[PDB]
Write a protein that binds this ligand. Structure first.
Ligand SMILES: O=C(Nc1ccccc1)N1C[C@H](O)[C@@H]2C[C@H]1CC[C@@H]2O
Length: 284
C-alpha cells in the first residue's frame, strides 16, 4: 500500500502495536559473540543491545578492537551510517578513535547527557574553547572551535588532532536537544529541519566517511533518523515514489543492527516524518 493512506488505516484501526510486533518477529538474528566476551563488559551500556559480528566497527588496535557500533550500508539509496551507543566513561577515547579511523565528518547526537534524572551518556566533548580534552588511551586531542545554539538544536565545530601524526580535522557536532524525556515529538517539523541541516553540511555525502549517529542505546531515536533519511532519498531517486515501503526499509536496516525503532510510537513517528518530509522536498 501507499504510505499516507496505510497510515490513516492503521490509525483508524488502532493496530500500531500489531504492526510493530510483526516487524520484531521478522527481524534478522545474527551472532554478536565479540560483544559478549567477558573482557568487553564495561564497553557495553546495555546487556541486551549489541552489534552483530558481521557489521560491527573494528578499532585499529591489536589489544582490543571492540566498540559497540555498527555499519548500516544502504545499497540502493547509496548512503551509509554508523550507529553507536552514547559513549561511556571508559569508551570516550574509543569513540573518537572510531571517528578518526572511519574518516567521518559529522557526529549526530539525539539525546541529552542527563534525562529522567539519570546519566544517558558521558560528557564527551569540551564545553569551553580554552579547556580542551586529551584522550591519553588513544592519543587524541579535541578542541571546541565554535558553538551555535538554536531553539531545537545546537551545532558545534570541533578540531580533532591525532597527536601521533599531528594531523588535524574539522568535525561537525549536530545536537538535537529537544526530544522529550517520554514519548515522541508531537510534530516532526523540528526533527526534519534538523535532518536537513545535517544534509546541507556535507556530513552525509559520499566524499566523507559515514556519519556517526547516537542516542543512549543507539537503536531508537538513532533508528528514526536513518530510516527517515533513507526513505526520503529513495522517494527522490525512484520513478514511482509511492513504491517506497517503510517497513521493508526498516527490516533491511535491521540486518545490520538489532532493535532499530524501539516502540510502536517511534514507528508511527517515523511514518509521520517521511510523509511530511516528502511534501516539503517538492518539489514543494
Ligand atoms: O577537516 C575537514 N573536513 C573533513 C574531511 C574529512 C573527514 C573529516 C573532516 N575540514 C573541512 C575543509 O576541508 C577545511 C578543512 C577542515 C576544516 C574546515 C575547512 O573547511
Amino acid at each position: 500500500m501507499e504510505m499516507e493512506k496505510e497510515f490513516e488505516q492503521i490509525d483508524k484501526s488502532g493496530s500500531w502495536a500489531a504492526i510493530y510486533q510483526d516487524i520484531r518477529h521478522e527481524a534478522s538474528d545474527f551472532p554478536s559473540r565479540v560483544a559478549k566476551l567477558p573482557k568487553n563488559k564495561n564497553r557495553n551500556r546495555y546487556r541486551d543491545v549489541s552489534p552483530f559480528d558481521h557489521s560491527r566497527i573494528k578499532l585499529h588496535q591489536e589489544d582490543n578492537d571492540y566498540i559497540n557500533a555498527s555499519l548500516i550500508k544502504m545499497e540502493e539509496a547509496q548512503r551509509s551510517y554508523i550507529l553507536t551507543q552514547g559513549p561511556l566513561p571508559n569508551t570516550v577515547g574509543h569513540f573518537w578513535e572510531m571517528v578518526w579511523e572511519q574518516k567521518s565528518r559529522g557526529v549526530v547526537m539525539l539525546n541529552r547527557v542527563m534525562e529522567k534524572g539519570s546519566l544517558k551518556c558521558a560528557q564527551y566533548w569540551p564545553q569551553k574553547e580554552e579547556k580542551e580534552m586529551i584522550f591519553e588511551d588513544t592519543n587524541l586531542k579535541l578542541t571546541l572551535i565554535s558553538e551555535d545554539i538554536k531553539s531545537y538544536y545546537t551545532v558545534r565545530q570541533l578540531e580533532l588532532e591525532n597527536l601521533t601524526t599531528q594531523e588535524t580535522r574539522e568535525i561537525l557536532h549536530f545536537h538535537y536537544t529537544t526530544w522529550p524525556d517520554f514519548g515522541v515529538p508531537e510534530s516532526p517539523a523540528s526533527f526534519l529541519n534538523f535532518l536537513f541541516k545535517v544534509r546541507e553540511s556535507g556530513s552525509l555525502s559520499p566524499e566523507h566517511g559515514p556519519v556517526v549517529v547516537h542516542c543512549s542505546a543507539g537503536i531508537g531515536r538513532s533508528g528514526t533518523f536513518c530510516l527517515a533519511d533513507t526513505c526520503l532519498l529513495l522517494m527522490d531517486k525512484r520513478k514511482d515514489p509511492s513504491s517506497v515501503d517503510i517497513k521493508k526499509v526498516l527490516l533491511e536496516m535491521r540486518k545490520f543492527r538489532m532493535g532499530l525503532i524501539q516502540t510502536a510510537d517511534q514507528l508511527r513517528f517515523s511514518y509521520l516524518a517521511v510523509i511530511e518530509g516528502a511534501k516539503f522536498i517538492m518539489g514543494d
